[PDB]
Design an enzyme around this catalytic site. Structure first.
Site, PDB file in Angstrom:
ATOM      1  CG  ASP A 182      -5.067  -0.723  10.465  1.00 16.09           C
ATOM      2  OD1 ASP A 182      -3.624  -1.281  10.210  1.00 16.09           O
ATOM      3  OD2 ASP A 182      -5.539   1.382  10.700  1.00 16.09           O
TER       4      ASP A 182
ATOM      5  CB  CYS B 294      -0.945  -0.001   1.537  1.00 18.98           C
ATOM      6  SG  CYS B 294      -2.445   0.624   0.930  1.00 18.98           S
TER       7      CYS B 294
END
Lengths: 205, 205
Positions: free
Chosen positions: B126, B7
């Protein structure tokens, strides 16, 4: 490492087994005259169930542009594989909205010269046709070699099976490899042991 | 084998190196306040250049639905990662048109209970937040274990780096693993040796 697309998926279990064995893309054939044909509705069910990071590719053969785009948004395809004799204009129009892979039949170098006109798109080289969906007691993979660096990304296809993938890959060193009947039990149904071995051999696992 | 998403890609060379090293997805952050932010226009340039069979994921944080869909069709994203506090209604509306991954901040089991309300979508966990984009001298990965089979597909994220991925994967056995700063030279620029090692360790190559 090479990417692997398993084409001609007609059912959820074959698709999930493909993903779990390591396939990077699954293909749905939207050509009505194919024995591996799957309706956009049946395909949508499968696509929606699959995990992210796995490409859903739709195979079209001389389909009119508007219909291709409607099936793509409906089934939520990630790429369109134009497997007919679609002109670059049609290819360029589709490409404005979704990624396009142009498939080209290849049996000699005049065919590779024809393929070079489509070099702006990822190319799927469908070796030795018509006959079936591909095949040969090994197509001379080396004839593609001198043209290799002319294309951005190349997907090798046609007659690949568990026993011959590595050789094809060693010679050409393509971005991806594609297979349908080389891992089938019969038309539309995959043989799981074959999918496993094909991916293991193609990727060196 | 696990899937790997890199990412926070802000430039073409980092993206191509990621693909060639084996990454299955690249992520573009469309959150204006992020140091890893990339405009839809800059992202489109990169997306269009990438090969097929590699997911382009767009990261949004509490963005209004219409804007998310416009950036997705423009940049030609394959999935949307909703990383804010988006309600299931917003998630379900986006999902009608494009695949959605719901990211959830996780630090204890009350957070995993919150995550279970989103179980209909692939979930990106996360771990240990806020602080930064993730992190910890190893978050207790085992606390996620009892909830593992409640989700369809799980993407592990937060503080993963070349030295700790394998351990995280051994414990949870997720579908995918995600990383941004754990493979960075500095904000927005990837360190290639790190991307290489991260993918090699995550996948066992």
């Amino acid at each position: 490492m090479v990417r692997v697309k398993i084409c001609g998926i007609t059912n959820l279990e074959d698709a999930l087994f493909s993903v779990e064995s390591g396939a990077d893309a699954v293909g749905f054939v939207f050509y009505p005259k194919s024995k591996r044909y799957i309706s956009p509705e049946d395909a949508r069910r499968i696509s929606v169930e699959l995990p992210p990071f796995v490409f859903r590719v739709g195979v079209f053969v001389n389909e009119e542009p508007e219909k291709i785009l409607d099936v793509a948004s409906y089934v939520q395809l990630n790429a369109v594989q134009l497997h007919g004799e679609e002109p670059i204009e049609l290819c360029r129009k589709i490409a404005e909205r979704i990624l396009v892979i142009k498939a080209v039949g290849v049996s000699n170098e005049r065919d590779m010269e024809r393929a070079l006109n489509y070099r702006e798109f990822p190319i799927l080289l469908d070796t030795k046709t018509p006959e079936y969906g591909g095949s040969g007691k090994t197509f001379d993979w080396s004839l593609i070699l001198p043209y290799r660096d002319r294309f951005r990304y190349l997907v090798l296809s046609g007659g690949l099976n568990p026993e011959n993938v590595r050789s094809a890959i060693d010679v050409v060193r393509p971005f991806a490899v594609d297979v349908s009947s080389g891992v089938e039990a019969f038309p539309g149904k995959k043989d799981h042991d074959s999918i496993k071995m094909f991916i293991k051999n193609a990727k060196g696992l």
